[PDB]
Amino acid sequence: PMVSVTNADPERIGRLLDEFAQDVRTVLPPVLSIRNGRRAVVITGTPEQLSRFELYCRQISEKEEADRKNKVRGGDVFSPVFEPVQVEVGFHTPRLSD
Amino acid sequence: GEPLAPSLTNVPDALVGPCWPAVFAAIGSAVTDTGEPVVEGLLSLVHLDHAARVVGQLPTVPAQLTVTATAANATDTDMGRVVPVSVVVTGADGAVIATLEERFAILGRTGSAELADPARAGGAVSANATDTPRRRRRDVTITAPVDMRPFAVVSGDHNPIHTDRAAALLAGLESPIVHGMWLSAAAQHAVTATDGQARPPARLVGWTARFLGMVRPGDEVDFRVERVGIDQGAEIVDVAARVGSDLVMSASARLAAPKTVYAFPGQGIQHKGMGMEVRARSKAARKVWDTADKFTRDTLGFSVLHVVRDNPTSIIASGVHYHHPDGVLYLTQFTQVAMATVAAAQVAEMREQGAFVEGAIACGHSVGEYTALACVTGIYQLEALLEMVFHRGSKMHDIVPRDELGRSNYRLAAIRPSQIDLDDADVPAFVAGIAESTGEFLEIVNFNLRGSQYAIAGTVRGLEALEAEVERRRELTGGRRSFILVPGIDVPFHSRVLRVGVAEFRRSLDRVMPRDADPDLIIGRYIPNLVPRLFTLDRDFIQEIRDLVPAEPLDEILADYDTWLRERPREMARTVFIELLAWQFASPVRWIETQDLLFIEEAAGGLGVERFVEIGVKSSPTVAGLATNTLKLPEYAHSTVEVLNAERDAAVLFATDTD
Amino acid sequence: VLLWAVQRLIGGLSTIGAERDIASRLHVVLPGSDGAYGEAK
């Protein structure tokens, strides 16, 4: 239930997390739970929701990579690295309020 | 292990928790014929078998349910003193939630009596089942826990033989043994485990298990679940747990039939010899074939069986002759009736063999809707659908002014928005803009696939403009062949030039449609093409079908419907049904929105289906392929929806496959 | 040459238009020529 996202701006990660929460199809949104570094965070949620969020992020990454490969504005490409944490339960989540 | 995951629904071995004290009290108060099996051998008591039968209701909100335990008069068999106890669970409203029958065997004292076998799969078989060949489903390796106190506290039975050592020695066992019902629930989870692959989820209705051997904690038990039979679509499955090389428990399961989708294709699949193998195979297929051909020869004036079996050049009906060079089948009404009769034959063969789900919803393409209504729902019979289809096909050709040589000024083609950067937010705008630029009439008709299948119908000059734009954008972006002209047909169906014969089609339908109708047979089971929502008895539905497309006999219901619902429910239901079916003719299809509603789970809104089997020929499975690409696209790539062809995948669909 | 030939001719000529166009029912005129009239009858 914990996935570490590196090489990404935490503010941008929160923004597209809100975007991923916006659509009706997602019944529960993953929540950014900890902030390790200036470009590293860990988000906590149901593993299916984490996989769907990785799908969304990789779609955005592929769009930006295709845009750069066509010789357009190519400053940087949003290519976060997703790595699974070695916990059993998620932590720092309001869903554990009870 | 890693690949499996517990099912989203509660396994039936969850209601057994709170009812343990009642069963123990029943055991304590149980009596044989002048004798009580509570004194002599309670320490030697063991769980013999467990049978679970559930009713469709299952609590989801924390409720206050009641259980009653009745202990039958214990007998004395050749293996031990068997005491059977029946427990039923009921909600606050008194409705029965589930029925459990478990027998306990006091291993010590025996007698001379017959040990009757427990009901198979909790007695959930409806006496109409076929022993299909066994198919491998899953194998699991679950290790019994070293300590069984956690299972004792979570379940509720604190029998010391499973936990204590002194009581285990007193009972005659070297070491404590695991709960048999732990094996029961482990096998249930193994049979209802979800792997994410293409297979419908398992919701057990009836489930029985017999415990043969004894398992010590820490023993590696391995299961093996095999498909056995089918019962009205729902399949019978069994599991044989084994610890090493000896059978320990043999359980059989009757799980619920998944809610499937029966899609019916549209034009373009017809060829010589449609479903003739099915005709030669089944007897119900022959029956529907004979009824259809007799009806066609008695009312229409031609033999549909000859039309499908052989492709002549021209046939003569009651009125005049019909000619088509590459085959008389390819012309409209003959193709439509061939589609209808082939779909009916396959549906009858499926439901005669027992592979048909009763509660499955019905959907299809523009003309496959009537076939769905007749076959899946049975709102009307074969003859009525055939006559209405032939009438609408005949009425279709004489509403568009055409050339004396057969030509017309309307052609359609399939535009593919691939690499041209188009989507649902731009495609209608693209069509409108290019139509204004051309100055001709252009419309959207078929919303088939989200990515690379759209249909545009319009004038020849407009279609040439479409082709030029598509080629220029293709050469701008690279070769894709995004524009393919339709072969042969030149009638702009689902357009505004088809508002002339709508009233005549409506009156023909009213003549054909029966005076009385059953709204319940169609409510919640039918997805119309023009409005992709479920058929519902709501003011919202009638408002949508009125404001989206005009209807002069509908404004009366809009003005007042509450007291009119209290007055004529059936009449107004039939009226809205026939109105929707009639204006389907001039309305474009919404296959995209129906597929979206049909593939999104119940959570977040949408019909969450498990099987999508379309009933069409194997020569060109258009609906199956388009559904496969729709599932394949990046959105809902994790959806475990099984897509099958009723002819190509017949072995899997009828469950007559092996390995 | 009279009876069997024309009867099989009737069968063959009326078989072709059977499945092609129903209610298309073939018509035959039989040449009926006292003793010769008896043979014709």
UniProtKB/TrEMBL annotation, chain A:
- What domain of life? Bacteria
Name of the featured protein: 3-oxoacyl-ACP synthase
Top-level taxonomy: Bacteria, Bacillati, Actinomycetota, Actinomycetes, Mycobacteriales
From-to range in the entire protein, with total length: 196 to 293 of 3069
Q: Which family does it belong to?
A: Belongs to the enoyl-CoA hydratase/isomerase family.
